């Protein structure tokens, strides 16, 4: 079973991609989706196998790279982190595969689409099941290639092309530090297997652990799109919506978080990287919420919400509470997909519009869609007793539970992020369904009213709901967002649970905050985010369809105008990235091509030598006149000059000086 | 509607709206190929999956029915 | 509705067929054929790597220690 979970999604993609001519459309869908449903079944079994029994399993197939000290194997280790991480990945992939049968049922290239998401599935399993960092990097590099291939699926659109170069290149900037970090691991340990790296980590130099951890952090920063290497993620929405659910909402962006959770035995022995973890996430979770409020595209808001919850995962790792990050990484996966997939049915219902300015009143038109997106929104805001409530709210308590300056500081930093999350949550939910119609007649013109004389058969198209394949994943993902967090809260959080006792998630006694979080935090702080969520959600409802001028007053106030555009334009980060990084790199190349490689290197080199030597040779040819008197005089000059050199015992430098000096005259014209 | 496209372009992923008339017959053939080597992967895994802990006899553990490194242990423990 | 698969593999139209240029026999039966025959023969080539030689000695060296309980007690 443990090698069939790995291999089975790969077979579906190969047949769907290289023999999709032979299997057709529905055959390619049947094969790829079955390979994922069956792989899902086994990974559910493997959860009970590994996790509930504490029996990890090791498979070594053959060796990948053998060079002296380094022995990298094609090998796979299932542990408590592996089977836990495989649950959201395989369940969501199965639903998105089913979701795509009815979503991409109009696109022509439908075999290539299903082969790519079945190839992404394979890579995400390769990543989390590896024995070592280098086999993990095959899945990491492959998830980037799959995300590139899906962000540029509509490759005749230039916008999708630029958003795919951004995704592939930003994620290589992280892989550079990831690759260098593995170099530091090989240097200091002679291998990079997880067993060898984590057994020896407590006894290794504290400074090299900082060096290794910093490189792991920068690599994790790019794929989890933290506040520095984040620009590729909102651009990834150029691809089809089901791609945005599986790869840019619940699985590939969670790879960076998994890397720090996997590397926890090493990074626990350096508080420096945990302090940067705690502040990277805090800055990211508020940097994201402040931007998502001002976005006019729905998918852009959901992408920005994904990076705020990813910052919440990174912040928790900084608290050295990797169980909560795993719990939140899993709980976020289920409801975020439902939000992307529920939104996806909204874009499909309307003529593929993605602007809030053209929606409203769709609640009577999308009753199931609104209900599931409301369930997903309460779990995202952490409304009490919902799946997302048990996970994210406990990170906030843990942050204050760590009775330090940074912990209390980033509890404040994250409590604004909670406030603005509620505000975007309301904006998506209100402007799409609960607001007055802002789109045209076509979205709303039902058939009850006639409005037509001889064309009553067609032209109605009043934004109907989806079909079976489109809504079934939405209903399945709704159950999880209501109940899943409660059922599994003992496995991850507990108070003394022993789920990760294979040294999968390592926590050091020195800075454990679990006991104080449940006991030392005052009651008001524990329940505060609930108070701030109800208060800030009614105000958002009150400032839209109840008062609703104050926003317009603010959007035209001179001060409010600039901060609207400051946050809509994403902190102006992309503006400064292009003109100071990529354009500068582009202009540096221009200098080398034009001034150096087709310029001075040619002139102070072959072309210059060629130009001058032709001139010099023609001048010496001029001395050739075929006149015997001139040639006699040349002989007499050379004769007496040889007498000068020999008789006078001149220095040989003089003779060399004369020769060059004569070439410089002969170089001079006339 | 349906996007016009060249009929002279050969794609391995099929093309534009490519569904063969024999899609079911070939999907059956490929599904057998996928199952056939997945079983081979299953056979190889069961022989080389190595564990350091033995599951309890009363516990749900479907791995017990094929994987050798604990299949022999159950019969070895059945000797007293 | 779906369309039947179409296209001209190698650019050969349905009326005509592919015409051999002269490189096919040498490439498939010679270069590729030799590479396959080489592959099976490689499966029988005896092991001559420095590791499998050094693993054998290193196994004995660790056997004469607390590691790697040796089959024979000598």
């Amino acid at each position: 079973m443990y090698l069939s979970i790995i291999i089975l999604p790969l077979l579906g993609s190969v047949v769907s991609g290289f023999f999709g001519r032979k299997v057709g459309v529905s055959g390619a869908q049947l094969i790829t989706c079955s390979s994922v449903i069956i792989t899902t079944i086994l990974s559910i079994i493997a959860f009970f196998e590994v996790g509930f029994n504490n029996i990890p399993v090791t498979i070594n197939i053959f060796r990948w790279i053998d060079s002296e000290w380094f022995i990298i194997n094609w090998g796979f280790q299932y542990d408590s982190l592996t089977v836990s991480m495989l649950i959201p990945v395989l369940i969501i992939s199965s639903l998105v595969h089913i979701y795509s049968i009815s979503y991409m049922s109009s696109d022509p290239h439908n075999q290539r689409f299903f082969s790519y998401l079945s190839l992404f599935t394979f890579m995400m399993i390769i990543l989390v099941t590896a024995n070592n960092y280098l086999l993990m990097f095959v899945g990491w590099e492959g998830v980037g290639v799959c995300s590139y291939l899906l962000v540029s699926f509509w490759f005749t659109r230039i916008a999708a092309n630029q958003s795919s170069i951004s995704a592939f290149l930003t994620n290589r900037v992280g892989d550079c530090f990831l690759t260098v970090g593995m170099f530091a691991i090989l240097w200091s340990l002679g291998n990079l297997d997880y067993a060898t790296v984590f057994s020896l980590a407590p006894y290794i130099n504290s400074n090299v652990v900082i060096i290794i951890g910093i490189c792991l952090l920068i690599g994790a920063m790019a794929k989890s799109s933290q506040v520095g290497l984040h620009v590729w993620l909102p651009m990834a929405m150029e691809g089809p919506t089901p791609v945005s659910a599986l790869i840019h909402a619940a699985t590939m962006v969670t790879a960076g978080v998994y890397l720090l959770m996997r590397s926890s035995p090493l990074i626990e022995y350096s508080s420096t990287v945990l302090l940067l973890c705690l502040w990277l996430g805090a800055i990211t979770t508020v940097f994201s919420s402040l931007i998502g409020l001002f976005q006019q595209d729905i998918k852009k808001v959901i992408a920005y919400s994904t990076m705020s919850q990813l910052g919440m995962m990174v912040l928790s790792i900084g608290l050295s509470s990797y169980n909560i990050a795993l719990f939140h990484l899993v709980n976020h996966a289920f409801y975020k997909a439902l939000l992307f997939l529920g939104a996806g049915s909204v874009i499909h219902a309307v003529a593929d519009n993605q602007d809030f300015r053209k929606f409203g009143g769709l609640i009577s038109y999308l009753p199931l869609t609104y209900s599931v997106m409301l369930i997903a929104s309460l779990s995202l805001v952490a409304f009490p007793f919902m799946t997302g409530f048990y996970s994210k709210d406990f990170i906030l308590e843990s942050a204050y539970g760590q009775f330090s300056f940074s912990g209390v500081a980033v509890y404040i930093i994250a409590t604004i992020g909670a406030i603005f999350t509620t505000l975007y949550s309301v904006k998506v939910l209100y402007l799409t369904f609960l607001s007055n119609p802002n789109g045209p007649r076509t979205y709303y013109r039902l058939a009850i009213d006639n409005f037509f004389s001889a064309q009553a058969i067609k032209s109605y198209k009043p934004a109907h709901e989806g079909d079976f394949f489109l809504t079934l994943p939405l209903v399945i993902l709704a159950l999880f967002s209501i109940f899943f967090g409660f059922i599994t809260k003992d496995i991850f959080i507990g108070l003394g649970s022993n789920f990760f006792v294979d040294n999968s998630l390592f926590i050091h006694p020195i800075h454990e905050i679990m006991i104080d979080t449940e006991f030392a935090v005052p009651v008001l702080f524990k329940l505060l985010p609930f108070i701030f969520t109800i208060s800030f959600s009614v105000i958002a409802l009150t400032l839209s369809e109840l008062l609703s001028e104050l926003v317009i007053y603010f959007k035209f106030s001179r001060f409010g105008y600039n901060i609207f555009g400051f946050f809509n334009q994403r902190f102006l980060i992309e503006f400064f990235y292009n003109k100071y990084i990529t354009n500068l790199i582009l202009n540096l190349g221009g200098q080398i091509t034009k001034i150096l490689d087709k310029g001075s290197i040619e002139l102070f080199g072959p072309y210059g030598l060629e130009r001058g030597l032709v001139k010099l040779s023609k001048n010496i040819s001029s001395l050739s006149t075929s006149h015997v008197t001139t040639y006699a005089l040349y002989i007499l000059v050379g004769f007496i000059l040889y007498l000068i050199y020999n008789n006078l015992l001149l220095d040989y430098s003089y003779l060399l000086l004369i020769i060059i000096l004569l070439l410089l005259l002969m170089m001079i014209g006339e | 509607p349906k996007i016009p496209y060249p009929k002279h372009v050969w794609s391995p992923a099929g093309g534009w709206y490519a569904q063969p008339a024999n899609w079911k017959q070939n999907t059956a053939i490929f599904g057998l190929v996928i199952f056939g080597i997945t079983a081979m992967v299953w056979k190889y895994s069961a022989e080389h999956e190595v564990r350091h802990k033995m599951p309890e006899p009363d516990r749900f553990y479907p791995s017990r029915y094929w994987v050798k490194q604990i299949k022999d242990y159950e019969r070895a423990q059945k000797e007293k | 509705q779906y369309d039947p698969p179409t296209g001209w593999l190698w650019g050969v139209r349905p009326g005509e067929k592919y015409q051999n240029e002269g490189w096919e026999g040498p490439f498939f039966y010679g270069f590729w054929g030799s590479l396959i025959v080489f592959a099976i023969a490689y499966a029988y080539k005896p092991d001559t790597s420095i590791q499998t030689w050094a693993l054998e000695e290193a196994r004995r060296r660790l056997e004469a220690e607390g590691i790697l309980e040796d089959p024979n007690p000598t």
Binding site: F18, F19, R21, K22 | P20, A21, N22, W23, N26, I29, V33, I37 | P4, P5, T6
Partner: peptide, 17 residues
């Protein structure tokens, strides 16, 4: 409704495995 042969590539890949 033209039929599709499995094709030599199917047997080359399957036969290779």
């Amino acid at each position: 409704n033209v039929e599709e042969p499995l094709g030599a590539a199917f047997y080359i890949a399957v036969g290779g495995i």
